[PDB]
Enzyme design. Structure first.
Site, PDB file in Angstrom:
ATOM      1  N   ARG A  52     -20.178  52.052  12.623  1.00 19.56           N
ATOM      2  CA  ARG A  52     -20.098  52.127  11.160  1.00 19.56           C
ATOM      3  C   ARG A  52     -20.944  53.247  10.555  1.00 19.56           C
ATOM      4  NH1 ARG A  52     -17.428  46.806  10.224  1.00 19.56           N
ATOM      5  NH2 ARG A  52     -18.846  45.165  10.959  1.00 19.56           N
TER       6      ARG A  52
ATOM      7  N   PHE B 129     -12.534  46.262  18.317  1.00 19.67           N
ATOM      8  CA  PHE B 129     -13.321  46.398  17.098  1.00 19.67           C
ATOM      9  C   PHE B 129     -14.322  47.551  17.191  1.00 19.67           C
ATOM     10  CE2 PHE B 129     -12.640  43.511  13.614  1.00 19.67           C
ATOM     11  CZ  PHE B 129     -13.610  43.856  12.681  1.00 19.67           C
TER      12      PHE B 129
ATOM     13  N   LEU C  17     -13.094  43.992   0.256  1.00 19.98           N
ATOM     14  CA  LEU C  17     -13.094  44.403   1.651  1.00 19.98           C
ATOM     15  C   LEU C  17     -11.711  44.349   2.283  1.00 19.98           C
ATOM     16  CD1 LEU C  17     -15.115  44.647   4.440  1.00 19.98           C
ATOM     17  CD2 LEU C  17     -14.052  42.408   4.705  1.00 19.98           C
TER      18      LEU C  17
ATOM     19  N   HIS D  16     -22.446  46.592   2.206  1.00 20.71           N
ATOM     20  CA  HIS D  16     -21.826  45.461   2.891  1.00 20.71           C
ATOM     21  C   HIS D  16     -22.844  44.464   3.452  1.00 20.71           C
ATOM     22  CE1 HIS D  16     -18.298  43.619   4.841  1.00 20.71           C
ATOM     23  NE2 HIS D  16     -19.104  43.386   5.861  1.00 20.71           N
TER      24      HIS D  16
ATOM     25  N   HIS E 224     -19.992  49.656   4.756  1.00 20.75           N
ATOM     26  CA  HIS E 224     -18.690  49.424   5.370  1.00 20.75           C
ATOM     27  C   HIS E 224     -17.688  50.472   4.886  1.00 20.75           C
ATOM     28  CE1 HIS E 224     -15.758  46.720   7.438  1.00 20.75           C
ATOM     29  NE2 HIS E 224     -14.925  47.343   6.626  1.00 20.75           N
TER      30      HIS E 224
ATOM     31  N   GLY F 202     -12.519  40.084   9.807  1.00 25.24           N
ATOM     32  CA  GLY F 202     -12.450  40.679  11.143  1.00 25.24           C
ATOM     33  C   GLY F 202     -12.461  39.671  12.273  1.00 25.24           C
TER      34      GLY F 202
ATOM     35  N   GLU G 153     -27.836  36.350   7.752  1.00 29.03           N
ATOM     36  CA  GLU G 153     -27.989  37.655   7.098  1.00 29.03           C
ATOM     37  C   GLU G 153     -29.365  37.810   6.444  1.00 29.03           C
ATOM     38  OE1 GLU G 153     -25.041  38.458   4.033  1.00 29.03           O
ATOM     39  OE2 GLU G 153     -25.067  40.612   4.456  1.00 29.03           O
TER      40      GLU G 153
ATOM     41  N   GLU H 224     -12.084  45.763   9.156  1.00 28.99           N
ATOM     42  CA  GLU H 224     -12.178  46.821  10.161  1.00 28.99           C
ATOM     43  C   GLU H 224     -11.186  46.539  11.292  1.00 28.99           C
ATOM     44  OE1 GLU H 224     -15.838  49.051  10.736  1.00 28.99           O
ATOM     45  OE2 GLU H 224     -15.964  48.259  12.778  1.00 28.99           O
TER      46      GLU H 224
ATOM     47  N   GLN I  17     -26.090  48.436   5.427  1.00 29.34           N
ATOM     48  CA  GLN I  17     -24.804  48.813   6.018  1.00 29.34           C
ATOM     49  C   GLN I  17     -23.767  49.208   4.973  1.00 29.34           C
ATOM     50  OE1 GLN I  17     -21.796  46.255   8.727  1.00 29.34           O
ATOM     51  NE2 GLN I  17     -23.261  47.503   9.882  1.00 29.34           N
TER      52      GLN I  17
HETATM   53  C1  LIG Z   1     -19.792  40.325   2.347  1.00 23.86           C
HETATM   54  C2  LIG Z   1     -18.906  40.148   3.542  1.00 23.86           C
HETATM   55  C3  LIG Z   1     -19.498  39.841   4.763  1.00 23.86           C
HETATM   56  C4  LIG Z   1     -18.716  39.681   5.906  1.00 23.86           C
HETATM   57  C5  LIG Z   1     -17.333  39.829   5.822  1.00 23.86           C
HETATM   58  C6  LIG Z   1     -16.739  40.136   4.600  1.00 23.86           C
HETATM   59  C7  LIG Z   1     -17.518  40.298   3.455  1.00 23.86           C
HETATM   60  C8  LIG Z   1     -16.843  40.633   2.156  1.00 23.86           C
HETATM   61  N1  LIG Z   1     -16.550  39.673   6.951  1.00 23.86           N
HETATM   62  C9  LIG Z   1     -17.129  39.365   8.167  1.00 23.86           C
HETATM   63  C10 LIG Z   1     -16.341  39.203   9.306  1.00 23.86           C
HETATM   64  O1  LIG Z   1     -15.124  39.335   9.238  1.00 23.86           O
HETATM   65  N2  LIG Z   1     -16.924  38.898  10.522  1.00 23.86           N
HETATM   66  C11 LIG Z   1     -18.294  38.751  10.606  1.00 23.86           C
HETATM   67  O2  LIG Z   1     -18.826  38.474  11.680  1.00 23.86           O
HETATM   68  N3  LIG Z   1     -19.079  38.904   9.480  1.00 23.86           N
HETATM   69  C12 LIG Z   1     -18.511  39.216   8.257  1.00 23.86           C
HETATM   70  N4  LIG Z   1     -19.302  39.376   7.123  1.00 23.86           N
HETATM   71  C13 LIG Z   1     -20.795  39.201   7.200  1.00 23.86           C
HETATM   72  C14 LIG Z   1     -21.122  37.703   7.204  1.00 23.86           C
HETATM   73  O3  LIG Z   1     -20.016  36.948   6.750  1.00 23.86           O
HETATM   74  C15 LIG Z   1     -22.349  37.366   6.361  1.00 23.86           C
HETATM   75  O4  LIG Z   1     -23.500  37.862   7.007  1.00 23.86           O
HETATM   76  C16 LIG Z   1     -22.463  35.854   6.160  1.00 23.86           C
HETATM   77  O5  LIG Z   1     -21.546  35.450   5.167  1.00 23.86           O
HETATM   78  C17 LIG Z   1     -23.861  35.415   5.746  1.00 23.86           C
HETATM   79  O6  LIG Z   1     -23.908  34.009   5.745  1.00 23.86           O
HETATM   80  P1  LIG Z   1     -25.281  33.211   5.492  1.00 23.86           P
HETATM   81  O7  LIG Z   1     -25.359  32.087   6.491  1.00 23.86           O
HETATM   82  O8  LIG Z   1     -26.495  34.099   5.631  1.00 23.86           O
HETATM   83  O9  LIG Z   1     -25.158  32.590   4.005  1.00 23.86           O
HETATM   84  P2  LIG Z   1     -24.089  33.110   2.913  1.00 23.86           P
HETATM   85  O10 LIG Z   1     -22.686  32.997   3.449  1.00 23.86           O
HETATM   86  O11 LIG Z   1     -24.392  34.523   2.477  1.00 23.86           O
HETATM   87  O12 LIG Z   1     -24.219  32.099   1.672  1.00 23.86           O
HETATM   88  C18 LIG Z   1     -25.441  31.951   0.991  1.00 23.86           C
HETATM   89  C19 LIG Z   1     -25.794  30.470   0.926  1.00 23.86           C
HETATM   90  O13 LIG Z   1     -27.132  30.311   0.499  1.00 23.86           O
HETATM   91  C20 LIG Z   1     -27.210  29.455  -0.625  1.00 23.86           C
HETATM   92  N5  LIG Z   1     -28.191  29.951  -1.607  1.00 23.86           N
HETATM   93  C21 LIG Z   1     -28.469  31.258  -1.911  1.00 23.86           C
HETATM   94  N6  LIG Z   1     -29.432  31.282  -2.859  1.00 23.86           N
HETATM   95  C22 LIG Z   1     -29.776  30.012  -3.161  1.00 23.86           C
HETATM   96  C23 LIG Z   1     -30.697  29.473  -4.053  1.00 23.86           C
HETATM   97  N7  LIG Z   1     -31.203  30.234  -5.016  1.00 23.86           N
HETATM   98  N8  LIG Z   1     -30.828  28.102  -4.145  1.00 23.86           N
HETATM   99  C24 LIG Z   1     -30.055  27.268  -3.361  1.00 23.86           C
HETATM  100  N9  LIG Z   1     -29.141  27.813  -2.479  1.00 23.86           N
HETATM  101  C25 LIG Z   1     -29.003  29.161  -2.380  1.00 23.86           C
HETATM  102  C26 LIG Z   1     -25.817  29.376  -1.222  1.00 23.86           C
HETATM  103  O14 LIG Z   1     -25.561  28.078  -1.699  1.00 23.86           O
HETATM  104  C27 LIG Z   1     -24.907  29.737  -0.066  1.00 23.86           C
HETATM  105  O15 LIG Z   1     -24.406  28.580   0.559  1.00 23.86           O
END
Ligand SMILES: *Cc1cc2c(cc1C)nc1c(=O)[nH]c(=O)nc-1n2C[C@H](O)[C@H](O)[C@H](O)COP(=O)(O)OP(=O)(O)OC[C@H]1O[C@@H](n2cnc3c(N)ncnc32)[C@H](O)[C@@H]1O
Ligand SMILES: C/C=C/CC/C=C/CC/C=C/CCCCCCC(=O)OC[C@H](COP(=O)(O)OCCN)OC(=O)CCCCCCC/C=C/C/C=C/CCC
Ligand code: HEM
Ligand SMILES: Cc1ccccc1C(=O)Nc1cccc(OC(C)C)c1
Ligand code: SF4
Ligand code: F3S
Ligand code: FES
Lengths: 138, 613, 239, 102
Positions: B289, B122, B255, B356, B245, B54, B389, B258, B243
Site C-alpha cells: 500500500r 491480495f 472504500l 484508512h 488506502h 477484502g 486497530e 483491494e 495508512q
Molecule cells: C475503515 C475500514 C476498515 C477496514 C475495511 C474497510 C473500511 C472502510 N475493510 C477491511 C477488510 O476488508 N479486511 C480487514 O482485515 N480489515 C478491514 N478494515 C480494517 C478493520 O476493519 C478495522 O481495523 C476494524 O474495524 C477495527 O475494529 P475494532 O475492533 O478496533 O473496533 P471498531 O470496529 O473500529 O469499532 C469501535 C468500537 O468501539 C466502541 N467505542 C468507541 N468509542 C467508544 C466510547 N467513547 N465509549 C464506548 N464505546 C466506544 C464502539 O461502540 C465500537 O463498537
C-alpha cells in the site's frame, strides 16, 4: 440476562413513560400491494357479514324465500337499478375470489418478486371487473 | 457534583468496544467463565468491522498449498522492519486456528470445488519466502467479509452470559496508582454517569481516521481509547504512521476493496498506461500500500490526473468477466453504483488514496497487555489490555498488509482473553476504587454540556481535519509539518472557546461529538508532532526531504565491517508520545523494536533488507 | 444558488409539555452531498446542533441511519435528495416505534427478538470444533445468498402492518428471514427444532403476505419470500 | 412436540382449494349434495378468517376469549341456518338461481 427477559424490560420502561409512538399510517406512503391487502380483508369481512345475515335470517325470520322474493318483485324495481344491486354483490365476491388465488399462489412460493407482485396485482384487479360485469349480465 | 447519578457496577473484566476484536475478547472471557462486561457507544453490528470487504488472511492452503511461515515473512517485510516480530510470529501461527474457529462459528465463507474456504490474492503476499510468485491466502465471504465476521461473532456471543452496555460512551479509564480498575462511562439513553470497576480492562475502541477531512472510516472512528490512555499519562505508539488506502471513491471517500486488484483489476492513469509497472516491476499493481498510494499521489503532481478538477484517478473493472464480478465483488458493485453512479461491468471506478488504517495506537504486549516506558525499558500496565486497530503491538509495523487487520482483531482479541484467563482467576478480589474517583471526568463532561463559548463545535472540527489533510498526508516535508504542528497546537487552545447548543440529558449528540472532538484532537496532536520528529522514509511515513531508510546499518551491503549506530542516532524504533492535557505540548520519547521471534527454530528471525516490489 | 426544503419530526424529552411538532430547514444542494444523511449532517453542523440521529458508515451497511423519508423506510446514506426544489422532503422516525428523542427509536425489543431465534451454528458435537473446517459445496453456499447480507436496519419490520399492531409477540420479517438463514445452512444440525420454535399463532403466523417489507428493503433483499419458505418447511418437515 | 399452528395453516388452504373447486362445481353440477358441502365450506373458511382477524386487532386476554366465543356462536348459527335452508326450503343453488334468472 436472557432473551425474553430483555423483552419484559422493554415494555416495563416504555409503557410507564412519556415516550410517544412514531406516526405510522398517519404519514406512511400508500402502495398497491398494501391497499390490495386491506381490500381483501374488507371484502372478507363484508362477505361473512352477508353470509351470516343469510344464515341468521333463515332461522330467526319467518316466511319462506319465495315470499321474500315477491316482496322484492313488488317494489317496482328499476331496469338498471336491479343490475346495480346485483353488481355490488358480485364485485366484492369476484375480487376476493381472484385475489384468493393470488394469495394461494404465494403459498406455493411462486410470483413473490416485486415485479410479479405488481403485475399479478393488476391482473387480479382487471379479471375482477370482467367477471363482475360478465356475471351481472348473465 | 450532585447533578449526575453516580451508578457503580461490579465485574471481573471490562471490554471497551464491541466490534471484531472487542467482541472476540468479550465472549472468549465468558467462555472461560468470567463475569464479563462489554461497554460500547454503538450497537455491536453498527461497529466498523462491518465495513470490511477484502477479507481475512490465513495460510490454510486450499487454493494450492501454503505455509504460515511464509505469511510471517510477508507481514514482517511489509512492516518495513518496524514490526515487532514476536507479535507477527504469534499472529501468523494462530491464523488458521482463529479462522477455522470462525467458520465453525458459522461465517458463510465463499466456497470452492473441494468445499473449502475460498482464499484469493491480495496486496503484497508471496509464496516460498517472497520467491515463489503471488500468494492466495485472503479468506473472504464474497466482498462482505467483515459484515459476516461481525455478525457471526455477535451471533455466537449471545451463547454466553456477557453483559452489554449498548450506547454507553466511555469517558475515561479508572486509574489508581499506575493500575487500571475499569472505566467511567456516560449512558447515551438517560444521561447518567456509570462507573464500571473490574480486575481487568480490555480496550478495543478502533482507529481515529476522523482526524482527517478525507477518510474511508465511519463517523464513529474517533480513537477514544487512544485518548483515554493519553489522559492517564500512558504512552502512545507509532501514531504518525497512517495508512493511505489507494482505492476510495472521489466523493465521500467510500472504500472500494483491494480485492479488485487481487482478482484482476488494473489501475490506469490519464494517458492510458498501467502506471503500476515503472513504479513496481515484480508485484506491480498488487504491491504494498505504501508503494501504490505513493505512486498515485506522485502521478497527480505530474499533471497526469483525471477529471474536471485533475485530482482523482481511475480503476479498471470493465475488462473483468461479469461472471465472477457479480459473484466475488457484488458489494462494491452496488456501492460504486450509488456514490459514483458507475456501471461496474462497463465503466471504470473513480478512486483516490485516502486515510484508512491507524498503524499506531496503544503500546501492546504480544499477549495483549498494555505497555508503558520506564527508564528505557518495558513495563506491564496492571489490569489493562488492548486489541485491534486501537492497539499497537505493531504487528503491522510501518505498513499494514492487505486484509491483516481482521486477523489482528480475532488473534489478539483471543490473546487478551487467554492472558486474563491464565494470569488470574474469575471471582478474585475486585480492587476497590476511591469514592471520589472519576472526579474530573464529570467536570470535563459538565463543562462541555453547559458550553457557552464563541466557536462552533463543527467549525473547529473541520479546522483540524483540513489542517491535517493538507499538512500531514501521503507526502510530507519538515517545512509544511512544522507549520501544521503550531497550527494544531494553537487549535488546542481554541477548545476552551467552543460553543454548544444542547442543554439536555437524553441523547445529547451535540455533547458526545464534542467528547469525540476532545478524543480526536489528542490523537491528532501526537500524529502531527510525531511526523515532524521522524526524519526518515519507512513505509507509510514518507519524507521528501529524508527519503532514507535509516536503520542500524545500511542493509543493502553485507553487514560485517560496518560499525553499529547508537540507539539515539538511527530511526528503527517505536515512537512513544505523551501529551500534557492542560498546556497541550507534546513530549515524546522512543523504544526499541522487537526483532526476536517466539521460537527461532520453528520460525527464524528475518533481518532488514531492500525495500521495494 | 439552489435551495431545498426539509420537514423533520422533532421531540425534546427534556422540556416537559413539549409535544411532537415539525421544523423546517433550508440548504443549498451545490454545497451538500447527494444523500439525505449529508443533508442531516449539514443542518446538524451549521444551522442547529440539537438535531439527533444515529449515523456511522455513510456507506449503507450499518442500519444506523434507518428512517422514514418521504413515506418509505430506507437508509439516509443510500437514498438521495429529490432534486425537485419546490417540494419539501418529509423525514420521520421509523413507524409505530417508541421514540427516545427525535428520529432515534427504541430497538430493544427488535434486538431481543433476534436473540430469541438463536442466530448461531448449532451442532451435536462441540468437541471436534475449532480444529477442522466444515465442508460446504458451492450450491449449498448459494442458498445463503440474499440472506447473509441483511444488515438489521429494521426498515423491514417497521414497515410491516402486522408488526405495528403485534410488535410484542410477532417477530417480523427481518428477524424471521435470519431464522430461515440458519435453517438452510448445510452445516446446521438444529433445523427441525428451529421450526418447532414457531408452533404458536403469533411467532410466524401473523404474516399474511401483505408485502411491505420487501418493497422497502434498502439492500434489495426479499424477506417476504423467505417467510413463505418457512411456512412451506413448517407443513412439510418430518417427525 | 405438537405442531398446532402448522397443521391448522394447512387446513385453511385445503378448504381454500375445496371452496374454489366448489363454486364452478355448484354451477355445472347443481344438486342437493352440493348445497350442504357448500354451506360447510362457506362457514368453516369464514370462521377461520375472522379467527385470524380477532388474533390480529383484538388486544387483550379476557377480551380475546370473548370475541372467539361469540364468533363460534355466529359461525354455528350461520351453519345451522344454511343447513335448515337446504332441508326445509329451496336450497342455496336455487336461491341464487331464482335470485339471478328472476
Ligand atoms: C475503515 C475500514 C476498515 C477496514 C475495511 C474497510 C473500511 C472502510 N475493510 C477491511 C477488510 O476488508 N479486511 C480487514 O482485515 N480489515 C478491514 N478494515 C480494517 C478493520 O476493519 C478495522 O481495523 C476494524 O474495524 C477495527 O475494529 P475494532 O475492533 O478496533 O473496533 P471498531 O470496529 O473500529 O469499532 C469501535 C468500537 O468501539 C466502541 N467505542 C468507541 N468509542 C467508544 C466510547 N467513547 N465509549 C464506548 N464505546 C466506544 C464502539 O461502540 C465500537 O463498537
Ligand atoms: C350465502 C348464500 C346466499 C346466496 C345469495 C348470494 C348470491 C350471489 C352469488 C353470485 C354467484 C354468481 C352465480 C350466477 C348465477 O346465475 O347462478 C348460477 C345459476 C345458473 O343458472 P342457469 O339456468 O344455468 O343459467 C343459464 C345461463 N345462460 O344456477 C346454478 O347453477 C346454481 C349455482 C350457484 C352457485 C353460486 C354460489 C355462490 C355462493 C357465494 C355466496 C356469497 C354470499 C354473499
Ligand atoms: C372460492 C374463492 C375464495 C378463496 C380461494 C379464498 C381464500 C382466501 C384466502 C387465501 C384468504 C387470506 C388468507 C391469507 O393468505 O392470509 C381469505 C380471507 C378471507 N376469506 Fe376467503 N376465499 C374465497 C372466498 C371467500 C368466501 C365465499 C368467503 C365467505 C364469506 C370468504 C371469507 C373470508 C374471510 C372472512 C377472510 C378473512 C381473512 C383475512 O383477510 O385475514 N372467502 N380467503
Ligand atoms: C393486519 C392486516 C392484515 C391484512 C391486511 C391488512 C392489515 C392491516 O391492518 N393493515 C393496515 C391497517 C390500517 C391501515 C393500513 O395502512 C394504510 C393507511 C395504507 C394498513
Ligand atoms: S432484510 Fe433488508 S430491510 Fe430487513 S432488516 Fe435486513 S437489511 Fe433491513
Ligand atoms: S411486510 Fe408483512 S405480514 Fe409478512 S410479507 Fe412482510 S412480514
Ligand atoms: S450510517 Fe451505516 S447505514 Fe447509514
Amino acid at each position: 440476562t436472557t432473551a425474553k427477559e430483555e423483552m419484559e424490560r422493554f415494555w416495563n420502561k416504555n409503557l410507564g413513560s412519556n415516550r410517544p409512538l412514531s406516526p405510522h399510517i398517519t404519514i406512511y406512503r400508500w402502495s398497491l400491494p398494501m391497499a390490495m391487502s386491506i381490500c381483501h380483508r374488507g371484502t372478507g369481512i363484508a362477505l361473512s357479514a352477508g353470509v351470516s345475515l343469510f344464515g341468521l335470517s333463515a332461522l330467526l325470520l319467518p316466511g319462506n324465500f319465495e315470499s321474500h322474493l315477491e316482496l322484492v318483485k313488488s317494489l317496482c324495481l328499476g331496469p338498471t337499478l336491479i343490475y346495480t344491486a346485483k353488481f355490488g354483490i358480485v364485485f366484492p365476491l369476484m375480487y376476493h375470489t381472484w385475489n384468493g388465488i393470488r394469495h394461494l399462489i404465494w403459498d406455493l412460493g411462486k410470483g413473490l418478486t416485486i415485479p410479479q407482485l405488481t403485475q399479478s396485482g393488476v391482473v387480479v384487479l382487471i379479471l375482477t371487473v370482467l367477471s363482475s360485469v360478465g356475471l351481472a349480465a348473465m | 457534583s450532585t447533578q449526575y447519578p453516580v451508578v457503580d457496577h461490579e465485574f471481573d473484566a471490562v471490554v471497551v468496544g464491541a466490534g471484531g476484536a472487542g467482541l472476540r475478547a468479550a465472549f472468549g472471557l465468558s467462555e472461560a467463565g468470567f463475569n464479563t462486561a462489554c461497554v460500547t457507544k454503538l450497537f455491536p453490528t453498527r461497529s466498523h468491522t462491518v465495513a470490511a470487504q477484502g477479507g481475512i488472511n490465513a495460510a490454510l492452503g486450499n487454493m494450492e498449498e501454503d505455509n504460515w511461515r511464509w505469511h510471517f515473512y510477508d507481514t514482517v517485510k511489509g512492516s518495513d522492519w518496524l514490526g515487532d516480530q514476536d507479535a507477527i510470529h504469534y499472529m501468523t501461527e494462530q491464523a488458521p486456528a482463529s479462522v477455522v474457529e470462525l467458520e465453525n462459528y458459522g461465517m458463510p465463507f465463499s466456497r470452492t470445488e473441494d468445499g473449502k474456504i475460498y482464499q484469493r490474492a491480495f496486496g503484497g503476499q508471496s509464496l516460498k519466502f517472497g520467491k515463489g510468485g503471488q500468494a492466495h491466502r485472503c479468506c473472504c465471504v464474497a466482498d462482505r467479509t467483515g459484515h459476516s465476521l461481525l455478525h457471526t461473532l455477535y451471533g455466537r456471543s449471545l451463547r454466553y452470559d456477557t453483559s452489554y452496555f449498548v450506547e454507553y460512551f466511555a469517558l475515561d479509564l479508572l486509574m489508581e496508582n499506575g493500575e487500571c480498575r475499569g472505566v467511567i462511562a456516560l449512558c447515551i439513553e438517560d444521561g447518567s454517569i456509570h462507573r464500571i470497576r473490574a480486575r481487568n480492562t480490555v480496550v478495543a475502541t478502533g482507529g481515529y481516521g476522523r482526524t482527517y477531512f478525507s477518510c474511508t472510516s465511519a463517523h464513529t472512528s474517533t480513537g477514544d481509547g487512544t485518548a483515554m490512555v493519553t489522559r492517564a499519562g500512558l504512552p502512545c505508539q507509532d501514531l504518525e504512521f497512517v495508512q493511505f488506502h489507494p482505492t476510495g471513491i472521489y466523493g465521500a471517500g467510500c472504500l472500494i476493496t483491494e480485492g479488485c486488484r487481487g482478482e484482476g483489476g488494473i489501475l490506469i492513469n490519464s494517458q492510458g498506461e498501467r502506471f503500476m509497472e515503472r513504479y513496481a516491476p515484480v508485484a506491480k499493481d498488487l504491491a504494498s500500500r505504501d508503494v501504490v498510494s505513493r505512486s498515485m499521489t506522485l502521478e497527480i503532481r505530474e499533471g497526469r490526473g483525471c477529471g474536471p478538477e485533475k485530482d482523482h484517478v481511475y480503476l479498471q473493472l470493465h475488462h473483468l468477466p461479469p461472471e465472477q464480478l457479480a459473484v466475488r465483488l457484488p458489494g462494491i458493485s452496488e456501492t460504486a453504483m450509488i456514490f459514483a453512479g458507475v456501471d461496474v461491468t462497463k465503466e471504470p471506478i473513480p478512486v483516490l488514496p485516502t486515510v484508512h488504517y491507524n498503524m499506531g495506537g496503544i503500546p501492546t504486549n504480544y499477549k495483549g497487555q498494555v505497555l508503558r516506558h520506564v527508564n528505557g525499558q518495558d513495563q506491564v500496565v496492571p489490569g489493562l489490555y488492548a486489541c485491534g486497530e486501537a492497539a499497537c503491538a505493531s504487528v503491522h509495523g510501518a505498513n499494514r498488509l492487505g486484509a491483516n487487520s481482521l486477523l489482528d482483531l480475532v488473534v489478539f482479541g483471543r490473546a487478551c482473553a487467554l492472558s486474563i484467563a491464565e494470569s488470574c482467576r474469575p471471582g478474585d478480589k475486585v480492587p476497590s476504587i476511591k469514592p471520589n474517583a472519576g472526579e474530573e471526568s464529570v467536570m470535563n463532561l459538565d463543562k462541555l454540556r453547559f458550553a457557552n463559548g464563541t466557536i462552533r463545535t463543527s467549525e473547529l472540527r473541520l479546522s483540524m481535519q483540513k489542517s491535517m489533510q493538507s499538512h500531514a498526508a501521503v507526502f510530507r516535508v519538515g517545512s509544511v509539518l512544522q507549520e501544521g504542528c503550531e497550527k494544531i497546537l494553537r487549535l488546542y487552545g481554541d477548545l476552551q472557546h467552543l460553543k454548544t447548543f444542547d442543554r439536555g440529558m437524553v441523547w445529547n449528540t451535540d455533547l458526545v461529538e464534542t467528547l469525540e472532538l476532545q478524543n480526536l484532537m489528542l490523537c491528532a496532536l501526537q500524529t502531527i508532532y510525531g511526523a515532524e520528529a521522524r526524519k526518515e522514509s519507512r513505509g507509510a511515513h514518507a519524507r521528501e526531504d529524508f527519503k532514507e531508510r535509516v536503520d542500524e546499518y545500511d542493509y543493502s551491503k553485507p553487514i560485517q565491517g560496518q560499525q553499529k549506530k547508537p540507539f539515539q542516532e538511527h530511526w528503527r524504533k517505536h515512537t512513544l508520545s505523551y501529551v500534557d492535557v492542560k498546556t497541550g505540548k507534546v513530549s515524546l520519547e522512543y523504544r526499541p523494536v522487537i526483532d526476536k521471534t517466539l521460537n527461532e527454530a520453528d520460525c527464524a528471525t528475518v533481518p532488514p533488507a531492500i525495500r521495494s516490489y | 444558488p439552489r435551495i431545498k426544503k426539509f420537514a423533520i419530526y422533532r421531540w425534546d424529552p427534556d422540556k416537559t409539555g413539549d409535544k411532537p411538532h415539525m421544523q423546517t430547514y433550508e440548504i443549498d444542494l451545490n454545497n451538500c452531498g447527494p444523500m439525505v444523511l449529508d443533508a442531516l449532517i449539514k443542518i446538524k453542523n451549521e444551522i442547529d446542533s440539537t438535531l439527533t440521529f444515529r449515523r456511522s458508515c455513510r456507506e449503507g451497511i450499518c442500519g444506523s441511519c434507518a428512517m422514514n423519508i418521504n413515506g418509505g423506510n430506507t437508509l439516509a446514506c443510500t437514498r438521495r435528495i429529490d432534486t425537485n426544489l419546490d417540494k419539501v422532503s418529509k423525514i420521520y422516525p421509523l413507524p409505530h416505534m417508541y421514540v427516545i428523542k427525535d428520529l432515534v427509536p427504541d430497538l430493544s425489543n427488535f434486538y431481543a427478538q433476534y436473540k430469541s431465534i438463536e442466530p448461531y451454528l448449532k451442532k451435536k458435537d462441540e468437541s471436534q470444533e475449532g480444529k477442522q473446517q466444515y465442508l460446504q459445496s458451492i450450491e449449498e453456499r448459494e442458498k445463503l445468498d440474499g440472506l447473509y447480507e441483511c444488515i438489521l436496519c429494521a426498515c423491514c419490520s417497521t414497515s410491516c402492518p402486522s408488526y405495528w399492531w403485534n410488535g410484542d409477540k410477532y417477530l417480523g420479517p427481518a428477524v424471521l428471514m435470519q431464522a430461515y438463514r440458519w435453517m438452510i445452512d448445510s452445516r446446521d444440525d438444529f433445523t427441525e427444532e428451529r421450526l418447532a420454535k414457531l408452533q404458536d399463532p403469533f411467532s410466524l403466523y401473523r404474516c399474511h403476505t401483505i408485502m411491505n417489507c420487501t418493497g422497502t428493503c434498502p439492500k434489495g433483499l426479499n424477506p417476504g419470500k423467505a417467510i413463505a419458505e418457512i411456512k412451506k418447511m413448517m407443513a412439510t418437515y418430518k417427525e | 412436540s405438537s405442531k398446532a399452528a402448522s397443521l391448522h395453516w394447512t387446513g385453511e388452504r385445503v378448504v381454500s382449494v375445496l371452496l374454489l373447486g366448489l363454486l364452478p362445481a355448484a354451477y355445472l353440477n347443481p344438486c342437493s349434495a352440493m348445497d350442504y358441502s357448500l354451506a360447510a365450506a362457506l362457514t368453516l373458511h369464514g370462521h377461520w378468517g375472522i379467527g385470524q382477524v380477532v388474533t390480529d386487532y383484538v388486544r387483550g386476554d379476557a377480551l380475546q376469549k370473548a370475541a372467539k366465543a361469540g364468533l363460534l356462536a355466529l359461525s354455528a348459527f350461520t351453519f345451522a341456518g344454511l343447513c335448515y335452508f337446504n332441508y326445509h326450503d329451496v336450497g342455496i343453488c336455487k336461491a341464487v338461481a331464482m335470485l339471478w334468472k328472476l
